[PDB]
Write a protein that binds this ligand. Sequence first.
Ligand code: HEC
Ligand code: HEC
Lengths: 125, 125
Amino acid sequence: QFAKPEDAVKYRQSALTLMASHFGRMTPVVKGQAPYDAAQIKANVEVLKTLSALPWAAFGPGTEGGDARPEIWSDAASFKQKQQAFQDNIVKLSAAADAGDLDKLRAAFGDVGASCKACHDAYKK
Amino acid sequence: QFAKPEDAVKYRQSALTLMASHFGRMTPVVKGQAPYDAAQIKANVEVLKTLSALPWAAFGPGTEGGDARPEIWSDAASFKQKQQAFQDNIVKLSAAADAGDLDKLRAAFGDVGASCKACHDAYKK
Ligand code: HEC
Ligand code: HEC
């Protein structure tokens, strides 16, 4: 869907920005600093899970650029591993949100965050 | 969800960028220059309809900035009108995609695009 590789970089960056907002805005709720409204969280996690699937298709062949490390493309198997692991962690967060369980939401949220950081430490400049 | 107003501007810009990609990438299919795979379009329109709901909440009070015209906030009723009209047009596009009907997809896609342009001509610098 990208006319030039830069278009793919801007796309991915925009997706990750939105993930990020939808992930991070739940921090105060996981920490108990904001109230827990199960329905509000369920609906937000449903936005996050749609968004969480989007960045990956925008690291296709020849879309080197941005703050992506080249290793994304020389170590493709490892990178697909780490995105699929992240997405699997999002499934667990969606299950927790769907159950309306603040303890399981907290644990799941931490799992997800560790998966963001694990990818970044290997693949983000 | 925004620590400062700039965070809201970057969010909205990122959302609109992603709408945009998910909208525009269907142009060749509406024009017949790429093949029509009903399932592929149905799934893409489902991403677009989630994305299409996101920018509006990031033009809250005091989030002036970006390429947003001030009229967004002095003419709030008009702006909510134009976003709700746009979203209603997205409903019609989702119905067309769900029906697997290329004629209705084409008409709906044009409706949607006119709603993007109508907002921009009033509210985007
Ligand atoms: C888990 C929820 C997250 C969160 C909150 C973010 N990411 Fe990542 N990310 C990855 C790479 C390769 C990039 C560089 C992309 C590029 O510049 O080309 C990034 C970038 C980001 C950003 C910055 C986006 C920007 O606006 O420029 C942010 C906000 C961000 N990430 C948040 C790689 C990955 C992963 C590899 C499998 C995974 C998993 C994540 N990121 C997860 C998350
Ligand atoms: C219909 C599908 C679309 C499409 C393809 C886009 N928009 Fe708009 N838009 C609106 C305003 C006020 C802004 C300025 C936002 C800001 O800078 O603060 C924009 C911006 C955009 C962009 C640029 C984003 C960027 O990366 O900076 C693009 C790509 C874009 N739009 C595409 C206002 C509206 C509407 C008001 C109700 C509606 C409807 C749309 N936009 C619709 C669409």
